[PDB]
């Protein structure tokens, strides 16, 4: 009925705000990115620092794993993305083509493509093997805050400070849907649900919304947290009870019951905005990360 997340480890090492945290699909690792221009790798179960991956010339806003846990992609203010071999630390490719800061990135399920979004208002699709830009979508009229592929890679969802979420056909680049509710606040995050039927979207009016994108209908809203300024990730927690997890500008992690929408737990400990959360793929473990006055990542574990 309610989880019991408790703090287990605090991970120190980044020298500026953390920007994103992600667990590897195989459960072994946590990757973090930061405004300090670095990616760090940590053990997912013990929080033990593994190594630093460097090469970007300016801060990093996002990092994402390939589905086989072998590669990372990062998005930077240096206007590039980089594809990294995690085991060796090597930069395999630098993806150049955005005309402004790159803010968000993800691999497709087959990890043969990368999608990126930028302050240049575009969504781009890149070939992983060659590192070349395949398609540029004139997607939005303001910076693109998130991009994510659906379960089979046939669709991309993007979100933007223009107030819209858009769904794109990967193969053709056509805009298939635009989603917006009754107000127009910036959309700061979007992702498809694990089963691919829904989209979870955050807006800078203190609201998370679950959409049936096929029907174009908002089915659930999650409120009670504070999110008026920063692009804060949100997650589906799948391993125990069915929860929604998000950071907050009041320095807490919020956890809601997906079905009932009630808050079930708040996690206290960070000393600045919780900008990013991630949920472990097999264990009831949450990672949270905070902005410049805190600079740490925390690992929390629950029995359900
Ligand atoms: O499949 S889901 O995306 C999902 C969400 C979470 Cl938190 C954990 C696991 C899964 Cl599988 N999903 C979307 N709506 C749902 C309603 C009931 C059960 C699952 C639902």
Swiss-Prot record:
PROSITE patterns: WD_REPEATS_1, WD_REPEATS_2, WD_REPEATS_REGION. The lineage of its organism: Eukaryota, Metazoa, Chordata, Craniata, Vertebrata. Changing residue 103 to D: Strongly reduced affinity for histone H3. There is a cross-link at residue 16 (Glycyl lysine isopeptide (Lys-Gly) (interchain with G-Cter in SUMO2)). The keyword Transcription regulation applies. GO terms for cellular component: ATAC complex; histone acetyltransferase complex; histone methyltransferase complex; mitotic spindle; MLL1 complex; MLL1/2 complex; MLL3/4 complex; NSL complex. Contributes to histone modification. May position the N-terminus of histone H3 for efficient trimethylation at 'Lys-4'. As part of the MLL1/MLL complex it is involved in methylation and dimethylation at 'Lys-4' of histone H3. H3 'Lys-4' methylation represents a specific tag for epigenetic transcriptional activation. As part of the NSL complex it may be involved in acetylation of nucleosomal histone H4 on several lysine residues. May regulate osteoblasts differentiation. It holds the Pfam family Beta-prop_WDR5. Interacts with PAXBP1; the interaction is direct and links a WDR5-containing histone methyltransferase complex to PAX7 and PAX3. Interacts with HCFC1. Component of the ATAC complex, a complex with histone acetyltransferase activity on histones H3 and H4. Component of the SET1 complex, at least composed of the catalytic subunit (SETD1A or SETD1B), WDR5, WDR82, RBBP5, ASH2L/ASH2, CXXC1/CFP1, HCFC1 and DPY30. Core component of several methyltransferase-containing complexes including MLL1/MLL, MLL2/3 (also named ASCOM complex) and MLL4/WBP7. (Microbial infection) Interacts with herpes virus 8/HHV-8 protein LANA1; this interaction regulates the MLL1 histone methyltransferase activity on viral DNA. One of its GO terms (molecular function) is histone binding. InterPro entries: G-protein_beta_WD-40_rep, WD40/YVTN_repeat-like_dom_sf, WD40_repeat_CS, WD40_repeat_dom_sf, WD40_rpt. Changing residue 259 to A: Reduced interaction with RBBP5 and reduced ability to stimulate KMT2A methyltransferase activity in association with RBBP5 and ASH2L. Changing residue 77 to A: Strongly reduced affinity for histone H3. Significant decrease in interaction with KMT2A. WD repeats lie at residues 13-52, 55-96, 98-138, 139-178, 182-223, 226-266, 269-303. Changing residue 195 to A: Loss of interaction with RBBP5 and reduced ability to stimulate KMT2A methyltransferase activity in association with RBBP5 and ASH2L. This is WD repeat-containing protein 5.
